[model samples]
Target: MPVKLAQALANPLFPALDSALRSGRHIGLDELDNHAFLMDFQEYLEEFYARYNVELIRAPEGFFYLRPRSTTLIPRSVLSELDMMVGKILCYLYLSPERLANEGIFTQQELYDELLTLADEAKLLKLVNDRQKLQEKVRSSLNRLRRLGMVWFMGHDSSKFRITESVFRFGADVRAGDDPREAQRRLIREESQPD
Candidate 1:
């Protein structure tokens, strides 16, 4: 019965599972099979890695990663991950109202096209208003994003990204602060349904 752990280890690769966490990379639907393996072996994997001092965190919406016990051993990009994480949340809030109702994958041009329209918004203006400035924006936020286990880029050179459902937790918070569109429209008694 307990030997099921050995079978799990035999089935999945040790590299992606180990290096992925060791490198602090988040495995999401981007690496479908690996995430499947992790979710399937949740307890066994957690305890196994816990032995090495890396804690495996399973995010509720989707994806997983390890937070290293010894921060010095692991390198983090000094680009300030937290301050720029709003870029991810802002992108999430602008895109969809629901968790499942999101762009499964997107390219740079697509983001530029969408946000370009909202050039008037102060956040958009400061962060990504210009078509040319998008790469740096992604470098700081999106780069750490995939590592943090919230978004996914299919390959090192790939332009398109698969955003994980985890961002919805924060998006939900922001929407509650502002209210949803359809529901908020009802607030104005003067407005009537076209139907």
Candidate 2:
């Protein structure tokens, strides 16, 4: 089972390589993601994506990590809990500081109030008339966030659990080795959403 460069880049630990590439230093995981993610957790994130043939690409401050289009980092729950859209939404929740700031004081529902309350895109009307899939995508993203431990239900939504301090690291530079297919599937299948 050879490791793919795509998978290696997808590995959360690749951020160390990413950062090192940018700064030309042997960066610790803790220092990755502009220190947004914890070193250990970042490695975990890398390992999670490694299975899917995806790697993180470094970007400016507060930007989402980049991954190859061919690799889908979607999580699979038997209950069908997570999807691509859901994962994106969850990423927004976890990565966004505004949401985390209010999380400390507000209830879960309250935190979601603004987000859920926001009017759907005009396309949602088409979703209602044509494909409900679009609407479901948004809802699924929320669920994905919940499953990933970015958001939690406290007392039936009366309380809120928001992840403010992340231990996962995704720094500025990324690197990876080549991976074979069977090996990639095995690794990715074992991964769940990061907490």
Candidate 3:
């Protein structure tokens, strides 16, 4: 995934985002902003663009051009996977599905525990904090899913999630590292291009 706008702004390469905006140079940050921060910023932008949608084009000169609202090419495949995760979580709420009826979606901390449980402590925790990384990853995916209209907020405040119209038609489970379609892309590229 591309680094977020905030990360690009926070990045040491272009620490002065406002100045860069005025100067017209897209820059990257040395320290990446976490997913929640990016999501919050995205929400703000969504509102900002709602009344007047903006079309942004990265010019050859490394600057961007903005126009009044226009068509947006969304990353649907990535959104679908995020929708699937939310849908999976929803499954736990409804009791109709016999197999998954009793199962509960892993909460933020529950998910952390599950990761630690499955991971070999010596190997996994040594390099970095896997739980923290996973949370960030999930947040990014969920935020993207919301933007794609594949997931939505059902309730108010902290307890709310609704499944979106975008059903993950491609049969694949959400696993560690990457989404299914991304994995498919990797596999296809590997098959099509030999080392």
Candidate 4:
């Protein structure tokens, strides 16, 4: 049974995926061949990644990636910042009941407008006192998430974007992931209505 792990490791497919998983990118159903390879060889890949002292995680949302690990190249401040922004994105989804009809897709401007609408209520959203600057921050934040494999801009010239399917795993646990209301505010989900 163990020998199967070694043989699977040698499949030519492993090369392409090796760097993806190492780089903290989620390989979800979008990459059909890459995803199926991962599904078929989970344990072997798990064993392989552990060699570098990182853990392999298969999100219930149906994607695979390496967990947060020590990397001098990218700082801890960066991951936490990204995580919170990702959190805000989820909260936006939660707020828009229209998200279901919209199928979780947001045009860049719609995303900007929606997030800014709540900027007054959330500290992170109010990172800048100036309204225009806050929009700049959100733009950079969305692009960062896009680069990190958590969001996808639909096409070369399209303004529409969707949170990656794997992120729904975070969405799955996000309500669960909040650490009570104080932290819920961190995720922009606090119920501070009627203000």
- TM-score (all chains, Cα) for each model: 0.58, 0.33, 0.28, 0.71
- Candidate 2 lDDT score relative to the true structure: 0.38
In terms of TM-score, how similar is model 2 to the real structure? 0.33
TM-score of 1: 0.58
Off by over 4 Å in 3: 1-129, 155-159, 170-195
Ranking by lDDT: 4, 1, 2, 3
Clashing pairs for predicted structure model 4, backbone only:
none
Off by over 4 Å in 4: 1-3, 69-77, 80-83, 94-101, 119-122, 169-186, 189-195
lDDT of 3 by residue, 37-147 (tens): 323454443333343344333333222222333343221112333334433333222212332442322234432343444334564444444555656655565554344
Q: Please, what are the lDDT tens digits per residue for candidate 2 over residues 14-110?
A: 6654543222221222344544543334555555545666554433332234243344544222223223223323333444445455653334343
Model number with the top lDDT: 4
lDDT of 1 at 24: 58
lDDT of 1 by residue, 1-195 (tens): 357677776774766577667765666666778878887888888877777666777866575766556533444433343223333443444345543555656665554554445333554455533545565665456665655555667678436666665443223333445654333222111000001
* Clashing residue pair totals per candidate (backbone < 3 A): 0, 26, 5, 0
lDDT of each: 0.54, 0.38, 0.34, 0.60
Q: List ranges where model 2 is wrong by over 4 Å.
A: 1-52, 56-108, 111-117, 125-141, 156-159, 163-195
Question: Which candidate number has the best TM-score?
Answer: 4
Between the candidate structures 2 and 4, which one is better when assessed by lDDT? Answer: 4
